[PDB]
Coordinates of N, CA, C and O and ligand atoms in Angstrom, one line a residue:
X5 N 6.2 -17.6 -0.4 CA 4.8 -18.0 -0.1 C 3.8 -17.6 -1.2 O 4.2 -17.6 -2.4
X6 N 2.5 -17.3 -0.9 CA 1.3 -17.0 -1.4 C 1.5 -15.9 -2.7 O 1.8 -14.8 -2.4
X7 N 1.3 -16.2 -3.8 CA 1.0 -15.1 -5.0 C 0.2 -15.1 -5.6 O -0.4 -16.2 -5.6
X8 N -0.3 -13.7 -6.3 CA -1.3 -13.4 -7.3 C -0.8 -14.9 -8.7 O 0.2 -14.9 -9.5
X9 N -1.9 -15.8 -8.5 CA -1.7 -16.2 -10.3 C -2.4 -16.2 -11.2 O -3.1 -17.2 -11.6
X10 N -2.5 -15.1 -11.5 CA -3.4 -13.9 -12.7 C -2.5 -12.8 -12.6 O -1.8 -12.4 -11.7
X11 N -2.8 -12.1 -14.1 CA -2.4 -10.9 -14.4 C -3.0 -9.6 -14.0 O -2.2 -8.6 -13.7
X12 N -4.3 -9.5 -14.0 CA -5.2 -8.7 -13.4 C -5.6 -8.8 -12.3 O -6.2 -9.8 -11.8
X13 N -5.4 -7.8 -11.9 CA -5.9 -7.2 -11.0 C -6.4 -6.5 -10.2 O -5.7 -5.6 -9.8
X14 N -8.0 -6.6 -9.7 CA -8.7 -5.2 -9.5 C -7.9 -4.7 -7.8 O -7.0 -5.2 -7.1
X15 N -8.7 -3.6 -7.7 CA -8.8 -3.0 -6.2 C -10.0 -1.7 -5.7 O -10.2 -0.9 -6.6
X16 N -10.4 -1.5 -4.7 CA -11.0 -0.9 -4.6 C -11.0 0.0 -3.3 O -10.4 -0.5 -2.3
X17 N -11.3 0.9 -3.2 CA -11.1 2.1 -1.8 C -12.4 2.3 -1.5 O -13.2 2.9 -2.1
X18 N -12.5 1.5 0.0 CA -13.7 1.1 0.7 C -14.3 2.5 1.0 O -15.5 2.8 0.9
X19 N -13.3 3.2 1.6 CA -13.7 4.2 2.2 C -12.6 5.3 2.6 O -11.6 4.9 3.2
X20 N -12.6 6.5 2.3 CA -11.6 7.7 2.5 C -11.5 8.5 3.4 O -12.3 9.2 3.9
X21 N -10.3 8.4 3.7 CA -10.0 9.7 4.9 C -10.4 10.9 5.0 O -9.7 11.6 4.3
X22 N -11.0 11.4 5.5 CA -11.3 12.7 6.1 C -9.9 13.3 5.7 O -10.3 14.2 5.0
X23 N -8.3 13.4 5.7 CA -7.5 14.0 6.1 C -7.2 14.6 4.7 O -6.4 15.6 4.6
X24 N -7.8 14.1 3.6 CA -7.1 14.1 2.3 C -8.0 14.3 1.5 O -8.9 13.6 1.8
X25 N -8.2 15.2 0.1 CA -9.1 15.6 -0.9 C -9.3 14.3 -1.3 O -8.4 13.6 -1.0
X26 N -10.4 13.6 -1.9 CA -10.9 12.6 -2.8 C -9.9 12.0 -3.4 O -9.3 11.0 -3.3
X27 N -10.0 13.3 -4.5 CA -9.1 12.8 -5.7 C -8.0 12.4 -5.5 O -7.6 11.4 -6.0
X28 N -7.2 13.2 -4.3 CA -5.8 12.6 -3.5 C -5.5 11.4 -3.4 O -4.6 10.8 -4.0
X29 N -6.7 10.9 -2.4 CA -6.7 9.5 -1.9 C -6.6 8.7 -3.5 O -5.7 7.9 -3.8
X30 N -7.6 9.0 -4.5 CA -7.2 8.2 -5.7 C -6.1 8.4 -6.1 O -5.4 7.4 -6.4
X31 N -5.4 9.6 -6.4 CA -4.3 9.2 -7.2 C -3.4 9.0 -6.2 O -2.6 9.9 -6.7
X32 N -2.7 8.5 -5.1 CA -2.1 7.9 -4.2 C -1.6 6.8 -4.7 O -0.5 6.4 -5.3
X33 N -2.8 6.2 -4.3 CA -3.5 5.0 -4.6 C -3.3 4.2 -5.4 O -3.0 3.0 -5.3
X34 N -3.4 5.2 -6.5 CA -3.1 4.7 -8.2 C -1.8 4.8 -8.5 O -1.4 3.9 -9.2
X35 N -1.0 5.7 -8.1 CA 0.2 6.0 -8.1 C 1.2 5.1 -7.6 O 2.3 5.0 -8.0
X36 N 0.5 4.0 -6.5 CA 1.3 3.3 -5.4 C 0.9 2.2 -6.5 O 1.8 2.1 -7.3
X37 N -0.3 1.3 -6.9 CA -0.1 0.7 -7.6 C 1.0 0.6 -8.7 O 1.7 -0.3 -8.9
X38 N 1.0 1.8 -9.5 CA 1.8 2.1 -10.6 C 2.9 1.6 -10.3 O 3.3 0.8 -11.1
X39 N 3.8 2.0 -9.1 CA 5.1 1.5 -8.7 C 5.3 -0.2 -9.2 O 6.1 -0.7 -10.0
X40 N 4.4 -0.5 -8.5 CA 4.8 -2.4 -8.8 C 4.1 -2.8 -10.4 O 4.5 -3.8 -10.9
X41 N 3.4 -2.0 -10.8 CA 3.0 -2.5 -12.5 C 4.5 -2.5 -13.1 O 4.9 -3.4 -13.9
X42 N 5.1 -1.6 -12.7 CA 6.5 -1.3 -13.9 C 7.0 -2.0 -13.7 O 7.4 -2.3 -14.8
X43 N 7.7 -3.2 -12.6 CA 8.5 -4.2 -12.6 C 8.1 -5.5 -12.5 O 8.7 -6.5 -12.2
X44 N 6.6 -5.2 -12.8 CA 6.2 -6.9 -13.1 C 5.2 -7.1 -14.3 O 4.8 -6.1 -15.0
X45 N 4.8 -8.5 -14.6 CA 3.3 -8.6 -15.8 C 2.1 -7.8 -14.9 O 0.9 -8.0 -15.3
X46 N 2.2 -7.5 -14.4 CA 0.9 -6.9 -13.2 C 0.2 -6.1 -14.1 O 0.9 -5.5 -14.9
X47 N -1.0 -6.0 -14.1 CA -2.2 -4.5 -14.5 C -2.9 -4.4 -13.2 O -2.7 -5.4 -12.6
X48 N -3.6 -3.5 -12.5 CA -4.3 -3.1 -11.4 C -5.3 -1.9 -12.4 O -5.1 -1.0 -13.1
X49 N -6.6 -2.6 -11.8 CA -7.8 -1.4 -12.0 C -8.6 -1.4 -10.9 O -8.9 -2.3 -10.2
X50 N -8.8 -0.1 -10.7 CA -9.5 0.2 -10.0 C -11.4 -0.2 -10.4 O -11.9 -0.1 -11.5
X51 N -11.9 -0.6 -9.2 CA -13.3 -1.0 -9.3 C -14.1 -0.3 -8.4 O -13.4 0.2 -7.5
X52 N -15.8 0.2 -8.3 CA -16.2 0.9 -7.2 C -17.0 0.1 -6.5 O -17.5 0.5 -5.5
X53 N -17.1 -1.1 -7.1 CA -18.8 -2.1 -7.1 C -18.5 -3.3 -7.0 O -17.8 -3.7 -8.0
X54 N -18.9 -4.5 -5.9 CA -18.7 -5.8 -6.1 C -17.1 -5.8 -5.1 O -16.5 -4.9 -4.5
X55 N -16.8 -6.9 -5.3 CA -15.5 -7.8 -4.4 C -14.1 -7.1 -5.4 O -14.3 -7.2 -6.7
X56 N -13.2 -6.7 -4.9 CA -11.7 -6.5 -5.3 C -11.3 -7.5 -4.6 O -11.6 -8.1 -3.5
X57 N -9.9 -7.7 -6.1 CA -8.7 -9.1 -5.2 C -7.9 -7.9 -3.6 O -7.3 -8.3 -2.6
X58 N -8.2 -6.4 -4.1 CA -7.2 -6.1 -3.2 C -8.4 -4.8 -2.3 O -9.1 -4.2 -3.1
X59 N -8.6 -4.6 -0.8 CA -9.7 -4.0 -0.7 C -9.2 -3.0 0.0 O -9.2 -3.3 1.2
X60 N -8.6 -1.5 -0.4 CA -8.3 -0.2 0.5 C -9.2 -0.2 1.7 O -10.4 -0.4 1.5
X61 N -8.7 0.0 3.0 CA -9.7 0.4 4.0 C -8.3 1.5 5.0 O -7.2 1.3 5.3
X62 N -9.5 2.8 5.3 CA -9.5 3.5 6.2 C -9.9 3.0 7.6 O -10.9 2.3 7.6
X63 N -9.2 3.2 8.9 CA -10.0 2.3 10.1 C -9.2 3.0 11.3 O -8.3 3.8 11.2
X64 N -9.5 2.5 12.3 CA -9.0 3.3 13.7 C -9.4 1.9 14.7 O -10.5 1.3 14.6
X65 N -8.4 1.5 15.7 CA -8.4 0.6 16.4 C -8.6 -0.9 16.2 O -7.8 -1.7 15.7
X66 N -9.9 -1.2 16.8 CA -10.1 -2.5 16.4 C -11.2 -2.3 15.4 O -12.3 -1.7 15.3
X67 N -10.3 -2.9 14.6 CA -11.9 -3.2 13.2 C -11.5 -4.9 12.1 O -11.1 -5.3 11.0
X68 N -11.9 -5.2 13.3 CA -12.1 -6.5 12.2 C -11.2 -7.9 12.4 O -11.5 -9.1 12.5
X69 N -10.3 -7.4 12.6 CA -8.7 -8.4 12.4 C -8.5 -8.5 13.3 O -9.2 -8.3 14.2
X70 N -6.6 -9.1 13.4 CA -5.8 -9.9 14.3 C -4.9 -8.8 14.5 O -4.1 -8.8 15.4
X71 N -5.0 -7.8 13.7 CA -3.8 -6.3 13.7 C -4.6 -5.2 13.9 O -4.8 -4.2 13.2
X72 N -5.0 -5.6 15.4 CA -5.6 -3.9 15.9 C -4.2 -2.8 15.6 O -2.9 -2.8 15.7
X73 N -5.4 -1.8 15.1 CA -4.5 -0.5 15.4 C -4.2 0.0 16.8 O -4.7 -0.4 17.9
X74 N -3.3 1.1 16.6 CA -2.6 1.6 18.1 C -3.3 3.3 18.4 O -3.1 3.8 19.5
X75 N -3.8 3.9 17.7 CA -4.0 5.0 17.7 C -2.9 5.9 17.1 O -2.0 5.3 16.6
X76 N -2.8 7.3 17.0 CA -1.4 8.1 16.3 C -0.3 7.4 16.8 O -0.1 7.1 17.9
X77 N 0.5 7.3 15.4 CA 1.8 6.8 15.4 C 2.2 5.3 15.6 O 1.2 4.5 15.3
X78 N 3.3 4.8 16.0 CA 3.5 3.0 16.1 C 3.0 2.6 14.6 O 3.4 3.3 13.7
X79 N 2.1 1.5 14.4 CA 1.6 1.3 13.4 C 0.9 2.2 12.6 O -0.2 2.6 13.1
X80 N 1.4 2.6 11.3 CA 0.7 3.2 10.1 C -0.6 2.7 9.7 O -1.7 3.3 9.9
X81 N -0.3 1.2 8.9 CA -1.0 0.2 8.2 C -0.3 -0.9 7.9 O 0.9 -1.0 8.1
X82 N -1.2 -1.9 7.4 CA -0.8 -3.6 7.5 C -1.9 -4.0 5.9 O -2.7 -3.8 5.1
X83 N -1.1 -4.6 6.2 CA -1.4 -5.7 4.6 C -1.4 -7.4 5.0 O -0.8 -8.0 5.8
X84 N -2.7 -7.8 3.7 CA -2.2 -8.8 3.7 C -1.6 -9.3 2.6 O -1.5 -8.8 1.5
X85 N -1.2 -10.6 2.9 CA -0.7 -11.8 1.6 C -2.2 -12.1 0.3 O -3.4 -11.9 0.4
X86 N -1.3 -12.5 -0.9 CA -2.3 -12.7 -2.1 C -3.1 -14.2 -1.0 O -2.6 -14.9 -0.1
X87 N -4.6 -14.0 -1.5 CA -5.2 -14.9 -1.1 C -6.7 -14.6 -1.1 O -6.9 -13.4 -1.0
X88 N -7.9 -15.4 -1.1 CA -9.5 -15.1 -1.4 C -9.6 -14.4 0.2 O -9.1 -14.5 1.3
X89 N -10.7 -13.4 -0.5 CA -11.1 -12.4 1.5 C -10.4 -11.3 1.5 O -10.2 -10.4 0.8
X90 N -10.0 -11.7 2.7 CA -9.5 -10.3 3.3 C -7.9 -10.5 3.0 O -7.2 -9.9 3.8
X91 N -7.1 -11.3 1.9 CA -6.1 -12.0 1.6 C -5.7 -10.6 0.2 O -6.4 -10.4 -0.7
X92 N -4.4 -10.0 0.6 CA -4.4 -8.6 -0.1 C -5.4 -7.1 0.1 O -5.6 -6.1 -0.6
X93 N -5.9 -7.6 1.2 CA -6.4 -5.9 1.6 C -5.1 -5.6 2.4 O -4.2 -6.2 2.9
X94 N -5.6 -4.2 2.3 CA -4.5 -2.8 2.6 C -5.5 -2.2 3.7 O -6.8 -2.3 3.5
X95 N -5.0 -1.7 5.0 CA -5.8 -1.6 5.9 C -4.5 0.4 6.6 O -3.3 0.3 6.7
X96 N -5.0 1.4 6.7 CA -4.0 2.4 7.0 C -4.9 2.7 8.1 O -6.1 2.8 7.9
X97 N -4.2 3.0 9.2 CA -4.7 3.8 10.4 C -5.4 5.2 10.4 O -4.7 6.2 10.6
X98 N -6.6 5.2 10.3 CA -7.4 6.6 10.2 C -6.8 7.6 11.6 O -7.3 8.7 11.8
X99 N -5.9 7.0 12.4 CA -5.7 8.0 13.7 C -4.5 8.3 13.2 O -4.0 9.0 14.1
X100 N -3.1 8.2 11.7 CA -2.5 8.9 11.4 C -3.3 10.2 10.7 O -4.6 10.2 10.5
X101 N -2.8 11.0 10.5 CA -2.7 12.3 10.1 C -2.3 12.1 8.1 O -1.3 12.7 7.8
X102 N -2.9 11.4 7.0 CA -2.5 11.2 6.2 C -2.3 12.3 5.1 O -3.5 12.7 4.7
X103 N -1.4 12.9 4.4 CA -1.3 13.6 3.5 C -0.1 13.2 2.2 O 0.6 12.3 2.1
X104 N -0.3 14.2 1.5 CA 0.3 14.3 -0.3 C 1.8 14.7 -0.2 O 2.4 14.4 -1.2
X105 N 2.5 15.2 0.7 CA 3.6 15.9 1.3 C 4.1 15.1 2.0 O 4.1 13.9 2.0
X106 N 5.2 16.3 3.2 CA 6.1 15.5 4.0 C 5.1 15.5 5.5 O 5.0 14.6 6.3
X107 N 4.6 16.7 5.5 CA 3.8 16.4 6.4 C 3.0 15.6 7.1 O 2.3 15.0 6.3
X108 N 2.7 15.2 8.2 CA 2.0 13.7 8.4 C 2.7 12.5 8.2 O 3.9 12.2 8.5
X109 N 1.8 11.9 7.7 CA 2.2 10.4 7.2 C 1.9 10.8 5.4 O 1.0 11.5 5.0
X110 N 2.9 10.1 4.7 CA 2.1 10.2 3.6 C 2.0 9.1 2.6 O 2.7 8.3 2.2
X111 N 0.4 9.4 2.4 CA -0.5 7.7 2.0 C 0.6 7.2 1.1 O 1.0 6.1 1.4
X112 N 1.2 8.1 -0.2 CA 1.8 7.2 -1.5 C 2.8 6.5 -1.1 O 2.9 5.4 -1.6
X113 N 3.6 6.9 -0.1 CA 4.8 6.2 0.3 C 4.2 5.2 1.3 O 4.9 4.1 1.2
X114 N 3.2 5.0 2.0 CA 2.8 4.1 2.8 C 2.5 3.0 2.1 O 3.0 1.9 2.3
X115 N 1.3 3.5 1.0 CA 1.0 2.4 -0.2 C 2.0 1.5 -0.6 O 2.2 0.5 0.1
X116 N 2.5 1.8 -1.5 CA 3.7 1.3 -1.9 C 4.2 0.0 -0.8 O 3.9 -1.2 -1.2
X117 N 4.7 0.0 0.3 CA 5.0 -0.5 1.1 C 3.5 -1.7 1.5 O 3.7 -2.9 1.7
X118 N 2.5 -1.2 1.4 CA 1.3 -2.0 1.6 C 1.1 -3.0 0.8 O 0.8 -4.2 1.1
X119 N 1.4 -2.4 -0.8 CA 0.9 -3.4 -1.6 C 1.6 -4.4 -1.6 O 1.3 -5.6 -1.6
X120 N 3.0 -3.7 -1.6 CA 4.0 -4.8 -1.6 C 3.9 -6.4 -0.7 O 4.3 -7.5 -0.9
X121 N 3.4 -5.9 0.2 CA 2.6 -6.9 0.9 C 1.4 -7.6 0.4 O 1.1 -8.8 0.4
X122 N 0.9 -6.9 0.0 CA -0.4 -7.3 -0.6 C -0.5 -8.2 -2.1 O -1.4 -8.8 -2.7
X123 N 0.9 -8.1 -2.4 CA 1.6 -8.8 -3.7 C 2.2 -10.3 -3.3 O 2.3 -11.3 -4.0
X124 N 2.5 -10.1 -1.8 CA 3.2 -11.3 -1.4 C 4.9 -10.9 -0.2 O 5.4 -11.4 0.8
X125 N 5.4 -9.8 -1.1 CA 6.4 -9.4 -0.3 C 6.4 -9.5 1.2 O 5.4 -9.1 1.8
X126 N 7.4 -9.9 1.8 CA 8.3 -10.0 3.5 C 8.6 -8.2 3.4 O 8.8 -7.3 2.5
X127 N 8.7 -8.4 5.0 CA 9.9 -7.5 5.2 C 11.1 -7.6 4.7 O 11.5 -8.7 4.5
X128 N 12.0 -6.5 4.4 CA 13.2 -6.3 4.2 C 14.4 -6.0 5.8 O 13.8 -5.3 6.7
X129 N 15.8 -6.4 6.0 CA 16.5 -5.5 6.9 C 17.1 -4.5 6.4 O 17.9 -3.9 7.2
X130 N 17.0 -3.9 4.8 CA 18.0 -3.2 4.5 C 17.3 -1.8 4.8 O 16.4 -1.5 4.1
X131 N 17.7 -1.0 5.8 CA 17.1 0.2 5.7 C 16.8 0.7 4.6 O 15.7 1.3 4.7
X132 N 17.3 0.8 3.2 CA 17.1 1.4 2.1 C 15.7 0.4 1.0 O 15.4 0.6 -0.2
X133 N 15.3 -0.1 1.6 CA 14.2 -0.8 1.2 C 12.8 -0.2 1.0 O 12.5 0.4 2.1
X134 N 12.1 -0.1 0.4 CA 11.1 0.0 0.4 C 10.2 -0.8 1.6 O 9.5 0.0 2.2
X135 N 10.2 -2.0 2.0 CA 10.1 -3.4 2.6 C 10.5 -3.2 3.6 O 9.9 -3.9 4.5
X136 N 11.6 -2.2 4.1 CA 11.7 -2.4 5.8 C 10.5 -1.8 6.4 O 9.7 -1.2 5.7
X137 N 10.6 -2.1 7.9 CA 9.2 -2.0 8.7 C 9.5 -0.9 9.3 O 9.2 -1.0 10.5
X138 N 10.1 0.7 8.9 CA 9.6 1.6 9.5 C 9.5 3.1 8.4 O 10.5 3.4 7.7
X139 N 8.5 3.8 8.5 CA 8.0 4.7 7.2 C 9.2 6.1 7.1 O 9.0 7.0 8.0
X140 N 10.0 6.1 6.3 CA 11.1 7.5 5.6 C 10.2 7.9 4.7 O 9.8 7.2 3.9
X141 N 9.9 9.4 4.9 CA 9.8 10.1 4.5 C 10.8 10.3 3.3 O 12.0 10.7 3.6
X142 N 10.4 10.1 1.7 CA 11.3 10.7 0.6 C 10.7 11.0 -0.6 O 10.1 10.3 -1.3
X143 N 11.0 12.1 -0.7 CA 9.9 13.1 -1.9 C 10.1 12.5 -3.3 O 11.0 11.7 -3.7
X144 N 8.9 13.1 -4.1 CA 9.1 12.0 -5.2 C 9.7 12.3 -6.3 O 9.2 12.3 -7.4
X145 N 11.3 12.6 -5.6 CA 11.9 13.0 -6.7 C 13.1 12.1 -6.8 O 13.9 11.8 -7.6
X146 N 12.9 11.8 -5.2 CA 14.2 10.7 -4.8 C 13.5 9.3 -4.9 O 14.2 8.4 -5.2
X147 N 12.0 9.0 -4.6 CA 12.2 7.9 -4.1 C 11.9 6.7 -5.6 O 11.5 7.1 -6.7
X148 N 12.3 5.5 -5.1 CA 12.2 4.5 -6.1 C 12.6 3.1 -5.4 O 13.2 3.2 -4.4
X149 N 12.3 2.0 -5.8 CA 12.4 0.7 -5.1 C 14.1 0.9 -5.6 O 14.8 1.4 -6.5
X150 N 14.2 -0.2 -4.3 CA 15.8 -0.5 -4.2 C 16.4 -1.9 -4.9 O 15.5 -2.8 -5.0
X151 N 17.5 -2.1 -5.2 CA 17.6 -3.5 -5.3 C 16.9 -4.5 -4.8 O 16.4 -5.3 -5.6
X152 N 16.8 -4.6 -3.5 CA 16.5 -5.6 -2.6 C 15.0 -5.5 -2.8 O 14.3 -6.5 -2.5
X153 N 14.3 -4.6 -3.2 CA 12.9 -4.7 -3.7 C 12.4 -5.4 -4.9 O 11.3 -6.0 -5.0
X154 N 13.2 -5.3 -5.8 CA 13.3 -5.5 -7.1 C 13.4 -6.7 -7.4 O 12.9 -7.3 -8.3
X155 N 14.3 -7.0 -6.3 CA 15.4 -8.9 -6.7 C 13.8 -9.4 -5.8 O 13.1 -10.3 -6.3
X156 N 13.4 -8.7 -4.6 CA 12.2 -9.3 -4.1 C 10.9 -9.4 -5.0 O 10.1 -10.3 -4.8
X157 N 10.7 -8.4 -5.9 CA 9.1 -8.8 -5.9 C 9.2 -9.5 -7.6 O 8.1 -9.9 -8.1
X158 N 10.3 -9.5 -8.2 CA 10.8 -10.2 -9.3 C 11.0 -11.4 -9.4 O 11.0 -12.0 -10.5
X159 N 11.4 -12.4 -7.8 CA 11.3 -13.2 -7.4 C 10.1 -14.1 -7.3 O 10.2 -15.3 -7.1
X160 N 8.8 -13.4 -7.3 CA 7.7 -13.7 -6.9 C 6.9 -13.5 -8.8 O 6.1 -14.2 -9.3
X161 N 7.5 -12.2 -9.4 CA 6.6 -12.2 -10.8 C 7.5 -11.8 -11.6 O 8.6 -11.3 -11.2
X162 N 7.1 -12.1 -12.8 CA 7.9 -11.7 -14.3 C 9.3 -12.9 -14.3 O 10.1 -12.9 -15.2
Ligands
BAT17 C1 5.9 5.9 12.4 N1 5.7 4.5 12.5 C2 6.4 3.6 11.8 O1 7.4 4.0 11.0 C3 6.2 2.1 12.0 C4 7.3 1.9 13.0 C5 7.1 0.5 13.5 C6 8.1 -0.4 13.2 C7 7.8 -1.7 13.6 C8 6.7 -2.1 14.3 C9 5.7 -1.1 14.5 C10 5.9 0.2 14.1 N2 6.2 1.3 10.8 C11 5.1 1.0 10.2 O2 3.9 1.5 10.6 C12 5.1 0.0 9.1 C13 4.6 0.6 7.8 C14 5.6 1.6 7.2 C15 6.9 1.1 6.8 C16 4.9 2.4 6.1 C17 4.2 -1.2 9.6 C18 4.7 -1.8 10.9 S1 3.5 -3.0 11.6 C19 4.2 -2.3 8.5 O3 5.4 -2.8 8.2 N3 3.1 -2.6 7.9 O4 3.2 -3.6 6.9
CA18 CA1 -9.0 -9.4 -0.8
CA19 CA1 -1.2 3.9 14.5
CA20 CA1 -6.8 10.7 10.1
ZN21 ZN1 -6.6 -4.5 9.5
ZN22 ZN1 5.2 -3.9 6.5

């Protein structure tokens, strides 16, 4: 379906969690984009002012959409497909507990999984995916996109 057709790409972080230092939430953030720059033509900059193709939001329950949150736990966060609007925002449940660690939920590993959405990416069935629909915990010494990530978002760029 739906892809980025441009190389650039802004994003911006509407608003930050209470749960996590500033800087945190940026380099997350930045870090989760980083993942998908390396295997595609992609660039991502961050913007603070004006419309992003991709729009970070903090939120709790109903705000806005068709993908109310649940409160702690169940759903994390939701993404959408490339597209004008709300088409590639990243939306994370402010009623998880978000952190840098194993503790909580943690934003980088969620990211990743968001944007990929936010790029165009489906779900995955292979547990070892980046892309399946439920969040593992793996420190970042282990983690890295899998095959079926790779063959996926390669499919769509480069
Ligand atoms: C502790 N909670 C979870 O692990 C839930 C479990 C779950 C599975 C299916 C349906 C609902 C919840 N997974 C998510 O929050 C998904 C995001 C994770 C992979 C970072 C979320 C499900 S919507 C999603 O895929 N967004 O794009
Ligand atoms: Ca958008
Ligand atoms: Ca939730
Ligand atoms: Ca929180
Ligand atoms: Zn939403
Ligand atoms: Zn998902």
């Amino acid at each position: 379906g739906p892809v980025w057709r441009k190389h650039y790409i802004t994003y911006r972080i509407n608003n930050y969690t209470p749960d996590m230092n500033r800087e945190d939430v940026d380099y997350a953030i930045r870090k989760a984009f980083q993942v998908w720059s390396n295997v595609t033509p992609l660039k991502f900059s961050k913007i603070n002012t004006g419309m992003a193709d991709i729009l970070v939001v903090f939120a709790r329950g109903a705000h806005g959409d068709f993908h109310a949150f649940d409160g702690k736990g169940g759903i994390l966060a939701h993404a959408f497909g490339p597209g004008s609007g709300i088409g590639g925002d990243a939306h994370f449940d402010e009623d998880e507990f978000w952190t840098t660690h194993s503790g909580g939920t943690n934003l980088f590993l969620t990211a990743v999984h968001a944007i990929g959405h936010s790029l165009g990416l489906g779900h995955s069935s292979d547990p070892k995916a980046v892309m399946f629909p439920t969040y593992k915990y793996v420190d970042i010494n282990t983690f890295r996109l899998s095959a079926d990530d790779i063959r996926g978002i390669q499919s769509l760029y480069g």
